[PDB]
Amino acid sequence: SSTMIDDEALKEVCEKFECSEEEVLSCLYNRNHQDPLAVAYHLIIDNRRIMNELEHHHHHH
Ligand SMILES: [Mg+2]
């Protein structure tokens, strides 16, 4: 199997939550969506996506 991790989001969660990388990876692996570390990881990725979409719309629409 192959698992993809967003390294930048992982680093940001670890810095902001003062936690180990394995703590984040564990809740992702266990699909424990309710763990705030998982929520934060996906929030960082989702917001990056949304901001990229908004910037595009601002400049081109
Ligand atoms: Mg405008």
UniProtKB/Swiss-Prot annotation:
What tissues express this gene product? Low expression in kidney, liver, lung, heart and brain.
Compartments annotated for it: namely: Cytoplasm; Nucleus
Modification comment? Ubiquitinated.
Q: What is known of its domains?
A: The AIS (autoinhibitory sequence) region shows some sequence similarity with the ubiquitin-associated domains and represses kinase activity.
General function of this protein: Catalytic subunit of AMP-activated protein kinase (AMPK), an energy sensor protein kinase that plays a key role in regulating cellular energy metabolism. In response to reduction of intracellular ATP levels, AMPK activates energy-producing pathways and inhibits energy-consuming processes: inhibits protein, carbohydrate and lipid biosynthesis, as well as cell growth and proliferation. AMPK acts via direct phosphorylation of metabolic enzymes, and by longer-term effects via phosphorylation of transcription regulators.
Subunit relationships: AMPK is a heterotrimer of an alpha catalytic subunit (PRKAA1 or PRKAA2), a beta (PRKAB1 or PRKAB2) and a gamma non-catalytic subunits (PRKAG1, PRKAG2 or PRKAG3). Interacts with FNIP1 and FNIP2.
Family, similarity comment: Belongs to the protein kinase superfamily. CAMK Ser/Thr protein kinase family. SNF1 subfamily.
Protein name as annotated: 5'-AMP-activated protein kinase catalytic subunit alpha-1
Which organism encodes this protein? Rattus norvegicus (Rat)
In terms of the parent sequence, the fragment covers 295 to 347 of 559
